[PDB]
Design a protein around this ligand. Structure first.
Ligand SMILES: [Cl-]
Length: 285
C-alpha cells in the first residue's frame, strides 16, 4: 500500500519517514507536481508538501506585498501570502504556486538576507549569518548558494531571495546550524533546493505545532536536509519557518479568475501570517 509515490519511496528510503498514512500526488499544471504526505519522523507525526517545478517550463520571482521594488516601509508592507500572488497577477505575472520568503527583523521592519528583484537591490546588507540565497541571473540561470556568490555577478544579478541554514551543499547533507539558537528545535519549515543540473526546483512546506488533525510536530534541520537530498536536491536552503510557513497554489475558478488558496495549516493557530516577502512560481514571459 504505502508509500505509493516516488517521493514517498525516496523519503522512506532516506530513513526520515516511517508509518506513511498519506501519500498523494497531483499535477498543479504542466511543469509543477505536488506531493502531500503524512508520516512519522523518529516517532513524531509530520505532514508535508513537496513541489517539483520544471524550470525549463516555469520560472520564479521573489515577491513583495505590492510587487514594488523598494524596501519594506512599515506594517502595511506585510500581508498574507495570497495577497502577494494577487498583486503579482495584477502586474502582468501569471502565478501558479507560492511560499513565504526570507527572515525579517523588526523596528524597523527589514529583510535579513539578500533581496534582489528585477535587477533592483532591496537589500545587499545581509545580517550576520544570513548568508544563504536562491538567485537568478539575467540570463535565466537559477542557483542556490551564498550571498557573496550572488553579489559577485554585479549587474547580472536579477533575483535573490535570502534564507538562513544551508541544508544541502553539492549533494552532501549539511549540519552546521549551531549558531541558529532555538531555530534548531523542531519547527514548521519552508525550504527550497535545486537538482544538480539546476533544471528542477524542489520546494518543501513542513507543517508544525500540531494545529490540525495530522498532529504534525515539525522537523529539525538535519532531518529536513536529509529529506531534501533524498528527493533530488544537490543544493538546498532553509527559508523562514514557524508561523510564517505558508503554501498557495493557483485555482482557476469557473469564469477564469484565479484564486490562491492556502494548502497548509498556518502554525499561528491556523491564522495565515502576514509576511513581507515571498517566492512565486510564475510563467515565463
Ligand atoms: Cl526591507
Amino acid at each position: 500500500g504505502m508509500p505509493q509515490t516516488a517521493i514517498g519511496r525516496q523519503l522512506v528510503e532516506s530513513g526520515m519517514a516511517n508509518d506513511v498514512t498519506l501519500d498523494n500526488e497531483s499535477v498543479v499544471r504542466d511543469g509543477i507536481k505536488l506531493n502531500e504526505l503524512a508520516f512519522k519522523t523518529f516517532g513524531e507525526s509530520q505532514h508535508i508538501f513537496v513541489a517539483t517545478i520544471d524550470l525549463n517550463e516555469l520560472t520564479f520571482t521573489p515577491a513583495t506585498k505590492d510587487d514594488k521594488n523598494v524596501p519594506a516601509t512599515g506594517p502595511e508592507s506585510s500581508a498574507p501570502l495570497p495577497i502577494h500572488a494577487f498583486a503579482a497577477e495584477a502586474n502582468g505575472k501569471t502565478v501558479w504556486l507560492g511560499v513565504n520568503g526570507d527572515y525579517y527583523a523588526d523596528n524597523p521592519r527589514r529583510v535579513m538576507g539578500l533581496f534582489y528583484k528585477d535587477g533592483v537591490c532591496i537589500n545587499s546588507q545581509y545580517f550576520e549569518g544570513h548568508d544563504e540565497v536562491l538567485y537568478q541571473l539575467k540570463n535565466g540561470e537559477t542557483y542556490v548558494g551564498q550571498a557573496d556568490e550572488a553579489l559577485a555577478h554585479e549587474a547580472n544579478l536579477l533575483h535573490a531571495l535570502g534564507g538562513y541554514g544551508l541544508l544541502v551543499k553539492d549533494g552532501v547533507v549539511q549540519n552546521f546550524y549551531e549558531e541558529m539558537g532555538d531555530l534548531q528545535n523542531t519547527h514548521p519549515r519552508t525550504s527550497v533546493g535545486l537538482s544538480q543540473d539546476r533544471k528542477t526546483m524542489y520546494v518543501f512546506v513542513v507543517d508544525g505545532r500540531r494545529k490540525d488533525s495530522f498532529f504534525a510536530l515539525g522537523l529539525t534541520l538535519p532531518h529536513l536536509a536529509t529529506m531534501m537530498k533524498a528527493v533530488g536536491c544537490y543544493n538546498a536552503i532553509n527559508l523562514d519557518g514557524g508561523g510564517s510557513t505558508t503554501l498557495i497554489i493557483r485555482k482557476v475558478n469557473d469564469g477564469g479568475k484565479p484564486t490562491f488558496p492556502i494548502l497548509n495549516t498556518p502554525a499561528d493557530d491556523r491564522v495565515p501570517r502576514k509576511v513581507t516577502n515571498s517566492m512565486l512560481i510564475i510563467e515565463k514571459k
